Curated annotation (Swiss-Prot), chain B:
GO terms for biological process: response to antibiotic; transmembrane transport; xenobiotic detoxification by transmembrane export across the cell outer membrane. The inner membrane transporter component of the MexAB-OprM efflux system that confers multidrug resistance. Functions as the major efflux pump for n-hexane and p-xylene efflux. Has been shown in one study to be involved in the active efflux of the autoinducer N-(3-oxododecanoyl) homoserine lactone, thereby playing an indirect role in quorum-sensing; but has been shown in another study not to be involved in efflux of this autoinducer. Over-expression of the pump increases antibiotic and solvent efflux capacities. Implicated in the secretion of the siderophore pyoverdine. Belongs to the resistance-nodulation-cell division (RND) (TC 2.A.6) family. It is found in: Cell inner membrane. Keywords: Antibiotic resistance, Cell inner membrane, Cell membrane, Membrane, Transmembrane, Transmembrane helix, Transport. The lineage of its organism: Bacteria, Pseudomonadati, Pseudomonadota, Gammaproteobacteria, Pseudomonadales. Pyridopyrimidine derivatives, such as ABI-PP, are not exported by the MexAB-OprM efflux pump, bind tightly to a MexB hydrophobic pocket and so potentiate the activities of antibiotics such as erythromycin. GO terms for cellular component: efflux pump complex; plasma membrane. The chain crosses the membrane at residues 239-251. The gene is mexB. Induction: By growth under severe iron limitation. This is Multidrug resistance protein MexB. It comes from Pseudomonas aeruginosa (strain ATCC 15692 / DSM 22644 / CIP 104116 / JCM 14847 / LMG 12228 / 1C / PRS 101 / PAO1). The keyword Transport applies.
Swiss-Prot record, chain C:
It comes from Pseudomonas aeruginosa (strain ATCC 15692 / DSM 22644 / CIP 104116 / JCM 14847 / LMG 12228 / 1C / PRS 101 / PAO1). Disruption phenotype: Disruption of MexA, MexB and OprM significantly reduces active efflux of N-(3-oxododecanoyl) homoserine lactone/3-oxo-C12-HSL/PAI-1, but not N-butyryl homoserine lactone/C4-HSL/PAI-2. Induction: By growth under severe iron limitation. This is Multidrug resistance protein MexB. The inner membrane transporter component of the MexAB-OprM efflux system that confers multidrug resistance. Functions as the major efflux pump for n-hexane and p-xylene efflux. Has been shown in one study to be involved in the active efflux of the autoinducer N-(3-oxododecanoyl) homoserine lactone, thereby playing an indirect role in quorum-sensing; but has been shown in another study not to be involved in efflux of this autoinducer. Over-expression of the pump increases antibiotic and solvent efflux capacities. Implicated in the secretion of the siderophore pyoverdine. Signal peptide: none annotated. It comes from the Bacteria. Pyridopyrimidine derivatives, such as ABI-PP, are not exported by the MexAB-OprM efflux pump, bind tightly to a MexB hydrophobic pocket and so potentiate the activities of antibiotics such as erythromycin. The chain holds residues 52 to 151 of 1046 of the full protein. Belongs to the resistance-nodulation-cell division (RND) (TC 2.A.6) family. It is found in: Cell inner membrane. Component of the MexAB-OprM multidrug efflux complex, composed of six MexA subunits forming a hexameric tube, binding to a MexB trimer, which interact with the trimeric OprM outer membrane channel protein. OprM is thought to not directly contact MexB; instead, MexA joins MexB and OprM by forming a funnel-like hexamer anchored to the inner membrane. MexA may initially form a hexameric ring complex with MexB prior to OprM, then OprM undergoes a conformational change as it contacts MexA, allowing the periplasmic gate to open.
Length: 1030, 251, 100, 50
């Protein structure tokens, strides 16, 4: 295949130009983001049913929806959330591979088949169905510096006139805003309702009687009378616009003219919609936008377009309003691809340097600087052919692939130059002889490297996708490097090299290069007698080899296993929980003191605190809050003094002294999509035993034994502790014996305390809604229930304390379910230095004491980690079988492939030692670096054993040929090795965006490769002679 | 895509349906015509009637057997409990009442309503009390349910639902009620989802009912009165052994 | 309703929510004094129309909590619309006795 | 402001799309005649007889 193109080089050169042109066309059309779609596609359903209990919204919304979705495709598990604030969140989680559009429309369809069964107050709210994948591109945050504008004014300003230019730009997908638009909030008071003999049912009837569209017809509508010449679209009433048009609606009026307006009954005025959430940024009240990225779109120029939209809108904002960017994963992607471009340039210039250092000419030195960028550009094209995107993962897969990607062109130009040196032929026939000697070897490289990486693609889950990116990128690199080194490089080696005559190495050159030639053949013909001495009596050395294979076994047994390495992400979560029965201002007194501590004494690390009350990852309400504290960039906090995994401890050692609330600080994982846990997740669902108290005692027993075992550590409940909640008991016989109707009592207690959606109005050409409640000093006390008045049938007022006595209870503010049965969730962490499967075993051991009727079910990452633990000791043995098949194909026996597959232990030993010395874990990045150094060890091992077979086929013995082949092939190993560690070491010694990934991906690679070289070049012909004596 | 298209052409028409068929739950499933298997349940102590072990499968077995892989549509032979209010016109004439008044009382006196919060937002400045206020919860037991008022005069004399009607828990439709092998029983006829195989769906059904097995009461087995997977597994095994004997005959 | 209230009630909200779909070329709409509206979102060529309709009535649904109650009761009719009339099939009365 | 639609956007796409078609097909003919006959004289002959 190579001898056919080495005669005629222009065809191979334009094949390479077609490859590079297709890659250059594919560069300007690839989508690019931070992480690919690795989370399971979860669909959230959010209802904002206002002023409800924690079980009212559950038993009227959640069970009604969950018992009516039946038979959606690829369903894995569903959850729920019934907060005490009134919201709802069920997270339908699907199987991998399902595109989210048809799954979202199927759960939409089987929700809107259920929505007539939902109550009227819920189905007028509208049931929102969005995608719950936490990959936010950038968070545009709006603040108000002076304090004259609250959060709801900023949210209305956002939804009014910065959401219109933002969504019309390119690349911006769906997004949410904090809070929502205004609403004509109508504030009733019970004294004025007493003074006029009124009830809130009458106000709620008169509003929706005087604020509706009326479908008037036409003045001359069809059918026309004979002789009609007039047509006019008549209109009736219209939705009321301002507040002075709600002040002049009338509730009742006598025929004398004495009227009652909504003035002196209510106090209208535009306010917010959901008053529960309350965010603030560095002191100033703040709202914001959380922008997600649409599929198939660049992140960089679309983030620049969002910046340009805000910078073109900024001369029109009110005075005192800044637009801040707290969270933005644009520089993470930008630096993570910029370091790849820098290490590409460093790798090609550095292999040019070492190629000039070991070979004296310039024209043969120039050819990797051409032959590497053609496969570099073409792998983007045949990466776009599978439909991928430029991620962080596939870029680090590229950087893993570079040091082996250059080695094919290096060994080609080395073999051409040494055939030039030893016998002195013209360059086309010498390169023809070299290609005829590497014919089977290059396709053996292709088959062996594909066999050692392609079964790694065949996992399932988030683990499957994060291995599949690596695997397809570097397999594309292998399968394109083999053809551009078999097709392109000899065609140019036949043209642009310089001939060398017989028996010359350049000895009388002088200077530095003559000294280097002298020391190089000095160590070469010292290495001759060295390998002859270690091969002449080879019995006590295979004993050292089997000792060091015991070393890799009892060295890989020791170290713990991790799913992802610890990353300097840039954010830190600070969710708090005040004691139960706390209002909002106690949470704000905790939050703003925490904020001024993290800004006043921690000005070195914390840039800003976008903090918020009423919301955490535990459970919504009024007695909760967070502080999304966001660090400085990596170029402004040098050294290990200001990392996140030390700032968390420095913050927590003071947060132990905030004695008001249990302030908890935890770092996010490497991936924020499947994140917020860093461990295992468990639901303690009940299948048979009915009762909330029994499951609460079950969680109490489980948390009792969870803190006693040493294998478990930092085990917290994900739910909420019970709030002391207040109940009524409306004495219905004494109520209806006085004469009031019970529907009037239900309307009064559902409109006066909790809000009630009535209808919509129109302001600024935009449809906004109308709520109504009692005043913020007319519902705030248990003794203040005696102030509201229902109406008797005679027309006289009946007080509410005449038939309603109070009693305090103790219930839960967050009741969640799992697959249709109620449960409570934990957030467990493994012990420091122990494996995650060990913690899963030690936490499933505790479930042998729970009461009869309480089951357990796995979720989160543990559901994938438990079911994916049966293929990894299957497909690796399959891959060893396939590489045994390929090396039996190339080498014409069944025992000589052992001389190659006993060499990759010498590659894994150094990687395990280098990641045990400096203290790293067994994550996926070390595993793919382990696989690529195994691939490099097999790569050069098959070529040295193939020359060992070929020199025996020349007609000499085993002992002479095994030391002949290593003598002839030492210098590509030191070329590959020196250029390889010179190219990879600047990843490990540096830091910045994604420091932990680079440190996990570099040091195991260099430690494996150096040890693999220094053991393989001495021991591989020993394996060949030991297997050839059989 | 076909289900999505018939679904939006169904939601174009579903408000023009009557009000009471709209509150029943409209079902659109990808069911093929054959019954795949019938998960049956029969009692072995005689204490369970037909309606109670139909209630058991609808309330506990049905939904984990419905979220599973490859089950499109069910057919439950029987149904769950639904507490029925058996009116009679003698005692309905005794108090001068119409059944619309009873149907308005049992829609006004067991509702689970939006109550609010005792310290809800916005708060007056200087308020440090919060409690989720509870209105009326929905009535669970029948002795609690008999105390629904219907009319009461202001001199203290009232009528109750226990005086007008005879309440009690029973099924919601007494039309279909199976029986297996002589004993009273019931079951859930499972139809296969289209575009999917039968053996993996049946194995997932067996694993789901085996996971729900240690929570059923004593005196209640699970039986399989009808399934069409053993015939196809025996056919595959018969052709495989025919191949394995044909290769030996060719040898 | 008249045209401007139908516009500023329904069409502005669904116009705000129906941008950001992949392979989108231009979205345009109409309103009438009769009251009907017609949003005729037009995709870039190279898209399966089935998944296009799936995405259109997927992100149509989160406008329903913003649209009023006189339009939720009637249901939104989405369909794929070509612009040609392929065939007009019409009856006619040869008796002269029966009307339109 | 003005914005074309219907037929006009498609033919404006044609007007902004045609020179890329001419240059890219001309370059593909250049690559194929440099490919099969392997000289740098006769592809220039065909590229200046077009």
């Amino acid at each position: 295949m190579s001898k056919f193109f080495i005669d005629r080089p222009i065809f191979a050169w334009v094949i390479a130009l077609v490859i590079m042109l297709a890659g250059g066309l594919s560069i300007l059309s690839l989508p690019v983001n931070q992480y690919p779609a690795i989370a399971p596609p979860a669909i959230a359903v959010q209802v904002s049913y206002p002023g409800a209990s924690a079980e009212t919204v559950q038993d009227t919304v959640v069970q009604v929806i969950e018992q009516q979705m039946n038979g959606i495709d690829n369903l894995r598990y569903i959850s729920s959330e019934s907060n005490s604030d009134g919201s709802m969140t069920i997270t339908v989680t699907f199987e991998q591979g399902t595109d989210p559009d048809i799954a979202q429309v199927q759960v939409q369809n089987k929700l809107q088949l259920a929505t007539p069964l939902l109550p009227q107050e819920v189905q007028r709210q509208g049931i929102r169905v969005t995608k719950a994948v936490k990959n936010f591109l950038m968070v545009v945050g709006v603040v108000s510096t002076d304090g004259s504008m609250t959060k709801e004014d900023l949210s209305n300003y956002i939804v009014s006139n910065i959401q219109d230019p933002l969504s019309r730009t390119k690349g911006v997908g769906d997004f949410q805003v904090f809070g929502s638009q205004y609403s004509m909030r109508i504030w009733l008071d019970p004294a004025k309702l007493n003074s006029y003999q009124l009830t809130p049912g009458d106000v709620s009837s008169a509003i929706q009687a005087q604020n509706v569209q009326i479908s008037s017809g036409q003045l001359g509508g069809l059918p026309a009378v004979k002789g009609q010449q007039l047509n006019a679209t008549i209109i009736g009433k219209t939705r009321l616009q301002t507040a002075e048009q709600f002040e002049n609606i009338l509730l009742k009026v006598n025929p004398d003219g004495s009227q009652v307006r909504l003035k002196d009954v209510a106090d209208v005025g535009l306010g917010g919609q959901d008053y529960s959430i309350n965010a603030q940024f560095n002191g100033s009240p703040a709202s914001g936008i959380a922008i997600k990225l649409a599929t198939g779109a660049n992140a960089l120029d679309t983030a620049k377009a969002i910046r340009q939209t805000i910078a073109n809108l900024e001369p029109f904002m009110p005075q005192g309003m800044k637009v801040v960017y707290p969270y933005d994963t644009t520089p993470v992607v930008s630096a993570s691809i910029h370091e790849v471009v820098k290490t590409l340039g460093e790798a090609i210039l550095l292999v040019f340097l070492v190629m000039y250092l070991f070979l004296q000419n310039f024209r043969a030195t120039l050819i990797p600087t051409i032959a590497v960028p053609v496969v570099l550009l073409g792998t983007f094209g045949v990466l776009a052919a599978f439909g991928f995107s430029i991620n962080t993962l596939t870029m680090f897969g590229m950087v893993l692939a570079i040091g082996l990607l250059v080695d094919d062109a290096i060994v080609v130009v080395e073999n051409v130059e040494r055939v030039m040196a030893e016998e002195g032929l013209s360059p086309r026939e010498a390169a023809r002889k070299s290609m005829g000697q590497i014919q089977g070897a290059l396709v053996g490289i292709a088959m062996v490297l594909s066999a050692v990486f392609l079964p790694m693609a065949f996992f399932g889950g988030s683990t499957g996708v994060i291995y599949r990116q690596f695997s397809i990128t570097i397999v594309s690199a292998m399968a394109l490097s083999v053809i551009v080194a078999l097709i392109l490089t000899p065609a140019l080696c036949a043209t642009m090299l310089k001939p060398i005559e017989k028996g010359d190495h350049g000895e009388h050159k002088g200077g530095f290069f003559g000294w280097f030639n002298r020391m190089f053949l000095s160590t070469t013909h010292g290495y001759e007698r060295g390998v002859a001495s270690i091969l002449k009596h080879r019995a006590p050395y295979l004993l050292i080899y089997v000792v060091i294979v015991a070393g890799m076994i009892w060295m890989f047994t020791r170290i713990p296993t991790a799913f992802l390495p610890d990353e300097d992400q840039g954010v830190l979560f600070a969710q708090v929980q005040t004691p139960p029965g706390s209002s909002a201002e106690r949470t704000q007194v905790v939050v703003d003191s925490m904020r001024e501590y993290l800004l006043e004494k921690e000005s070195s690390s914390v840039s800003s605190v976008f903090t918020v009350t009423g919301f955490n990852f535990a459970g919504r309400g009024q007695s909760s809050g967070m502080a999304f504290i966001m660090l400085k960039p990596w170029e402004e906090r040098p050294g290990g003094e200001n990392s996140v995994f030390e700032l968390a401890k420095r913050a927590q050692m003071h947060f132990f002294s905030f004695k008001d609330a249990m302030v908890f600080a935890f770092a996010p994982p490497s991936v924020l999509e499947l994140g917020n846990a860093t461990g295992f997740d468990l639901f303690l669902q009940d299948q048979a035993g009915v009762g909330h108290e029994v499951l609460l005692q079950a969680r109490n027993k489980f948390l009792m034994l969870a803190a006693q075992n040493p294998a478990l550590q930092r085990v917290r409940p994900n739910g909420m502790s019970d709030e002391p909640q207040y109940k009524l008991e409306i004495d219905d016989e004494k109520a209806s014996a006085l004469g009031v109707s019970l529907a009037d009592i239900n309307s009064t207690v559902s409109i006066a305390w909790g809000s009630s959606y009535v209808n919509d109005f129109i302001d600024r050409g935009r449809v906004k809604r109308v709520y109504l409640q009692g005043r913020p000093d007319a519902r705030m006390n248990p003794d203040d229930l005696s102030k509201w008045y229902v109406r008797n049938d005679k027309g006289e007022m009946v007080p509410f304390n005449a038939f309603a006595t109070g009693k305090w209870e103790y219930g839960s503010p967050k009741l969640e379910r799992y697959n249709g049965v109620p449960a409570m969730e934990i957030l467990g962490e493994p012990a420091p230095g122990l494996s995650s499967g060990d913690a899963m075993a030690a936490v499933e051991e505790i479930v042998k004491q729970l009461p009869k009727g309480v089951g357990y079910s796995w979720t989160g990452l543990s559901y994938e980690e438990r079911l994916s633990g049966s293929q990894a000791p299957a497909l690796y043995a399959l891959s060893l079988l396939v590489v045994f098949l390929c090396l039996a194909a190339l080498y014409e026996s069944w025992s000589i492939p052992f001389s190659v597959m006993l060499v990759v232990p010498l590659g894994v030993i150094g990687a395990l030692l280098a990641t045990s010395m400096r203290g790293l874990s067994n994550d996926v990045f070390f595993q793919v670096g382990l696989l690529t150094t195994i691939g490099l060890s097999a790569k050069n091992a098959i070529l040295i054993v193939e020359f060992a077979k070929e020199l025996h086929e020349q007609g000499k013995g085993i002992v002479e040929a095994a030391i002949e082949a290593c003598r002839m092939r030492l210098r590509p190993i030191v070329m590959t090795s020196l250029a390889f560690i010179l190219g990879v070491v600047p990843l490990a010694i540096s830091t910045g965006a994604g420091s932990g990934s680079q440190h996990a991906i570099g040091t195991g690679v260099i430690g494996g490769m150096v040890t693999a070289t220094v053991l393989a070049i001495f021991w591989v012909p020993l394996f060949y002679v030991a297997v050839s004596t059989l």
